[PDB]
Amino acid sequence: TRPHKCPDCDMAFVTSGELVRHRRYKHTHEKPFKCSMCDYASVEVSKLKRHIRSHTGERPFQCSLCSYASRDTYKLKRHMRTHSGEKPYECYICHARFTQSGTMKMHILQKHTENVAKFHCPHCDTVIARKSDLGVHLRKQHSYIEQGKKCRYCDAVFHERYALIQHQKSHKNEKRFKCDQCDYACRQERHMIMHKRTHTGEKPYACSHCDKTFRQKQLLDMHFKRYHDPNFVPAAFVCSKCGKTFTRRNTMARHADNCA
DNA sequence: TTAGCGCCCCCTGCTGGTTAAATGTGGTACTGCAC
DNA sequence: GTGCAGTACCACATTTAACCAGCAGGGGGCGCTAA
Ligand code: NA
Ligand SMILES: [Zn+2]
Ligand SMILES: [Zn+2]
Ligand SMILES: [Zn+2]
Ligand SMILES: [Zn+2]
Ligand SMILES: [Zn+2]
Ligand SMILES: [Zn+2]
Ligand SMILES: [Zn+2]
Ligand SMILES: [Zn+2]
Ligand SMILES: [Zn+2]
To 5 degrees, how large is the angle CA A115–CA A117–CA A120? 135
Could you give the CA distance from residue A178 to residue A216 in angstroms, rounded to a whole number? Answer: 19
Residues with CB under 5 A from ligand 8 (ion): A 179, 181-182, 184, 199
CA of A165: nucleotide with nearest C1': C16
Q: Give this entry's resolution in angstroms.
A: 3.1
**Residue A152 shares a structural domain with residue A138:** yes
**Residue A31 shares a structural domain with residue A72:** yes
The DSSP bridge pattern shows strands A69-70 and A89-90 to be unpaired
Contact between residue A25 and residue A34 where contact means Cβ atoms under 8 Å apart: no
Last residue of a domain, one of A36, A64, A83: A83
Last residue of a domain, one of A34, A68, A83: A83
The DSSP bridge pattern shows strands A177-178 and A157-160 to be unpaired
CA of A126: nucleotide with nearest C1': C18
Torsion of CA A93, A98, A102, A106, to 10 degrees: -50
Residue A90 lies in a domain: no
**Residue A253 shares a structural domain with residue A203:** no
Backbone angles phi, psi at A197, to 5 degrees: -65, -40
Question: Domain holding A213: CATH number?
Answer: 3.30.160.60
Question: Domain holding A140: CATH number?
Answer: 3.30.160
Residue A219 lies in a domain: yes
Please spell the DSSP secondary structure of A123-191, one letter per residue: SSS-EES-HHHHHHHHHHTS-EEEEEEE-SSSS-EEEEHHHHHHHHGGGTT---EE-SSSS-EESSHHH
For residue A89, report the distance from its CA to the centre of ligand 4, in Å.
20
Residue A45 lies in a domain: yes
Contact between residue A26 and residue A7 where contact means Cβ atoms under 8 Å apart: no
Backbone angles phi, psi at A100, to 5 degrees: -135, 150
C-alpha of A190 from chain center: 32
Q: Which residue is nearest to nucleotide B4 (CA to C1')?
A: A46
For residue A46, report the distance from its CA to the centre of ligand 2, in Å.
21
**Residue A73 shares a structural domain with residue A27:** yes
Residue A97 lies in a domain: no
Residue A163, phi-psi category: left (phi > 0), alpha (psi -120 to 50), beta (remainder): alpha
Residues comprising chain A, all counted: 260
Residue A108 lies in a domain: no
User: Residue A125 is part of which domain span?
Assistant: 117-172
| Gyration radius of chain A's alpha carbons | 38
End-to-end CA distance of chain A: 106
A1 contact partners, CB below 8 Å, separation of at least 6? none
In sign, the C-alpha dihedral spanning A209, A214, A217, A218 is negative
Q: Which residue is nearest to nucleotide B25 (CA to C1')?
A: A188
Could you give the CA distance from residue A190 to residue A180 in angstroms, rounded to a whole number? Answer: 15
A26 contact partners, CB below 8 Å, separation of at least 6? A9, A11
Q: Where are the alpha helices (DSSP H) in A16-100?
A: 16-23, 45-56, 73-79, 81-84
**Which of A39-47's residues contact partners 24+ apart within 8 Å by CB, and which partners?**
none
**Residue A168 shares a structural domain with residue A181:** no
**Residue A157 shares a structural domain with residue A221:** no
The DSSP bridge pattern shows strands A144-150 and A127-128 to be unpaired
List bases in chain B with any atom under 7 Å of a protein Cβ.
1-16, 23-26, 28-32
Q: Could you count the other beta carbons within 10 Å of the beta carbon of residue A104?
A: 19
CA of A250: nucleotide with nearest C1': B31
Q: Could you count the other beta carbons within 10 Å of the beta carbon of residue A65?
A: 11
For chain A, what is the domain count?
4
Q: Where are the alpha helices (DSSP H) in A24-130?
A: 45-56, 73-79, 81-84, 101-111
Residue A33 lies in a domain: yes
CA of A45: nucleotide with nearest C1': B3
* Strand, coil or helix: A1: coil
Last residue of a domain, one of A172, A198, A214: A172
Residue A136 lies in a domain: yes
Contact between residue A207 and residue A213 where contact means Cβ atoms under 8 Å apart: yes
User: Does any strand C atom come closer than 7 Å to the Cβ of A73?
Assistant: no
Could you give the CA distance from residue A203 to residue A210 in angstroms, rounded to a whole number? Answer: 14
Contact between residue A205 and residue A215 where contact means Cβ atoms under 8 Å apart: yes
Residue numbers 16-55 of A with CB closer than 7 A to any atom of strand C = 17-18, 21-22, 25-26, 40, 42-44, 47, 50-51, 54
